[PDB]
Structure formats: C-alpha cells, structure tokens
Design a protein around this ligand. Structure first.
Ligand SMILES: COc1ccc2nc(C)c(O[C@@H]3C[C@H]4C(=O)N[C@]5(C(=O)NS(=O)(=O)C6(C)CC6)C[C@H]5/C=C\CCCCC[C@H](NC(=O)O[C@@H](C)C(F)(F)F)C(=O)N4C3)nc2c1
Ligand SMILES: [Zn+2]
Length: 198
C-alpha cells in the first residue's frame, strides 16, 4: 500500500583506496552500523579524500571514482540511488543503463583523476583491496589481465579505475570475463564515453 511504501537508501562512502604514497592500501572510514544509518538519512558528515572511494548500499559494496569533477560508478551497483552528503541525499547527474554507468557531482574534498589522452594500451586496474593489476587494453572497452586470477579477487571492484602509466583515468571497471572462474579479461566504460556523457 502507498502508506507503507519504502524508499531505497543512499549510496554511502565507507572508505577509499589510498594512492597518495608509494604503497596503495584500502582505508575504511565508516563501519557497517554507521553505513546503514547514513544510507537511511542520506546525511554523511565524514570528510572525503582521494580519487577512488569504496561505497556501499544496504546490500552491495563496490567502488566509485572521481574523474573531472564527477564521482562515477556502475548502474548495476548504484541503480538510480542518491549518494549521501553533508547536506543530505544528492541526486545522480548522469545515469546510463546502456553503459552500466552512473555519476554524481564529486564530493567536496575529493581529488579527481584527469581523463587520459595518452592513447596507451598499458593499463592498471585498481581494486577495492588496493591491488594494482596490469591490464593490456584489447579494445575500446576491454582489456586482458597480464596475470589471470579467480573472479573472487575482482568482485566488489566495479566502479574502480583503469589507469594509464601516467596515472590518468582510462575507464571505469564494469565487468569481468572468466573461464572456469578465472578472470582473463575485463570490460570497462572508456573515459571518452564518460566525456561523451558529460
Ligand atoms: C541492472 O541494470 C544493469 C545495466 C547494465 C549492466 N551491464 C553489465 C556488464 C552487468 O554485468 C553484471 C554485473 C557485473 C559484475 O559482476 N561486475 C564486477 C563487480 O565487481 N560487480 S560488484 O562490485 O561485485 C557488484 C555486483 C556490487 C555491484 C566487476 C565484476 C567482478 C567479478 C565478476 C563476477 C561474475 C560476474 C561476471 C559478469 N561478466 C559479464 O557480464 O561479462 C560481460 C561483458 C559478458 F558476459 F558479455 F562477457 C560481470 O562482471 N557482471 C555481471 N550488469 C548490468 C545491470
Ligand atoms: Zn594517460
């Protein structure tokens, strides 16, 4: 009934991937209890830092990446959800189910990656465990892992970046191609398709 109709909560930033130093490592900034409350209220007062955020809903966790002032992630994780912010829920400014893509305005305090114009095919995928995985670009939206590994190690990393050697954003990780559970290739939204969307 209309009176009891529920509302879905906001996506919540629960951590980040620190790429500041010589060592990449994941940091948690909010635990599950505070995440659940922040998802219901949409009010997140935690300071945001960095380029790659770890984000969560009530049921899923994945990544989100700031490029050119937009925090980008996957539609299959975020759906049409708002993201929590210090002033309350923030509505998506980009939504494209056909690309598996959504975006919100980048949060105050975040740093944005620069869109790559190098035209290089030697990429690096950043996962939610702060693994930096070499990927050879194989097409507009795909790349092969130089060292395959079980898909388990990539689960939860959709929305993370593929980067060029210079640290520019080349795309947003969206799917993994596997054989017998072994990830051999990845699919991603290329930054040009984001720059198109923008
Ligand atoms: C609902 O409206 C839409 C609109 C457009 C969509 N567009 C795609 C693309 C899609 O795909 C789905 C999800 C995605 C996936 O799993 N993403 C990763 C991930 O981590 N998600 S997540 O963070 O854990 C999560 C779920 C919390 C968000 C990186 C994976 C890591 C491991 C993979 C685990 C096994 C799933 C393999 C599958 N392979 C695939 O689809 O390959 C395509 C190219 C094929 F089939 F053609 F080869 C695949 O990767 N996904 C299957 N759902 C869409 C849904
Ligand atoms: Zn580049």
């Amino acid at each position: 009934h209309m009176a009891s109709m529920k509302k879905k909560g906001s996506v919540v930033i629960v951590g980040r991937i620190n790429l500041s130093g010589d060592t990449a490592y994941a940091q948690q900034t909010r635990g599950e209890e505070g995440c659940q409350e922040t998802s219901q209220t949409g009010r997140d007062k935690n300071q945001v830092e960095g380029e790659v955020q770890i984000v969560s809903t009530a049921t899923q966790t994945f990544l989100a990446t700031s490029i050119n002032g937009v925090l980008w992630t996957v539609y299959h994780g975020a759906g049409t959800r708002t993201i929590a912010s210090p002033k309350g829920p923030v509505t998506q400014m980009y939504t494209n189910v056909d690309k598996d893509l959504v975006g919100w305005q980048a949060p105050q305090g975040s740093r944005s990656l620069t869109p790559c114009t190098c035209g290089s095919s030697d990429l690096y995928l950043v996962t939610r465990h702060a693994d930096v995985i070499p990927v050879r670009r194989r097409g507009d939206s795909r790349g092969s892992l130089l060292s395959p590994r079980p898909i388990s190690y990539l689960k939860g990393s959709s929305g993370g970046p593929l980067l060029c050697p210079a640290g520019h954003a080349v795309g947003i990780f969206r799917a993994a191609v596997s054989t017998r559970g072994v990830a051999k290739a990845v699919a991603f939204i290329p930054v040009e398709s984001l720059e198109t969307t923008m």
